[PDB]
Amino acid sequence: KKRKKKSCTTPKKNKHKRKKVKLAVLKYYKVDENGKISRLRRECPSDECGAGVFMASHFDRHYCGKCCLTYC
Amino acid sequence: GVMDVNTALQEVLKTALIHDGLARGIREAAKALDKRQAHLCVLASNCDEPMYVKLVEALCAEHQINLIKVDDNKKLGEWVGLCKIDREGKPRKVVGCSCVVVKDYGKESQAKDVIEEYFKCKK
Ligand SMILES: [Zn+2]
């Protein structure tokens, strides 16, 4: 039995390529004229990411990337 | 203290390299430094981003952290330990670190002499 080649299918299933955000770390904190620090998003109650990591604001939800917590 | 001020960060970051207490990169620096588990922070002066000064100056201001500033990201890149070396010991490759956060210090009479002296005189 000589192995058949037979490569045909839906032409390409592309693998997700990383979205590169340039200096996206800066967007989190808001600095006023005095030098004050204003946090624009919400802190996460979970243990591991506690006080060191913030959440995400999506229109209907709040999402932390470490423990994958979700709120409405 | 027989040491010069500018050359003595080497022992702090070397022992912080050995005890696995260093955090490099702006996010892993800022975040973990805001966790109040980290004592002091080392920064670079020369930068192409104006907000990059605002972030960590405000952070070091409110969170009761001390601020050191170095010349270029390159020399700090030589301190952090990201420098790859040649066959004969030439520091050929340099990956520059503007943000350095110290969590676990080592026990040293030298670098703590110079840093404590510099920060006793700064206060
Ligand atoms: Zn979380």
UniProtKB/Swiss-Prot annotation, chain B:
Alphabetic keyword roster: Acetylation, Cytoplasm, Nucleus, Ribonucleoprotein, Ribosomal protein
Protein name per UniProt: Small ribosomal subunit protein eS12
Job of this protein: Part of the small subunit (SSU) processome, first precursor of the small eukaryotic ribosomal subunit. During the assembly of the SSU processome in the nucleolus, many ribosome biogenesis factors, an RNA chaperone and ribosomal proteins associate with the nascent pre-rRNA and work in concert to generate RNA folding, modifications, rearrangements and cleavage as well as targeted degradation of pre-ribosomal RNA by the RNA exosome. Subunit of the 40S ribosomal complex.
Subcellular localization(s) per the UniProt record: Cytoplasm; Nucleus, Nucleolus
GO cellular-component term (any): cytosolic ribosome
Positions carrying N6-succinyllysine: K120
The keyword Ribonucleoprotein is annotated on this UniProt entry: yes
Keyword Transcription regulation: no
Organism of origin: Homo sapiens (Human)
GO terms for MF: RNA binding; structural constituent of ribosome
Family: Belongs to the eukaryotic ribosomal protein eS12 family.
Pfam families: Ribosomal_L7Ae
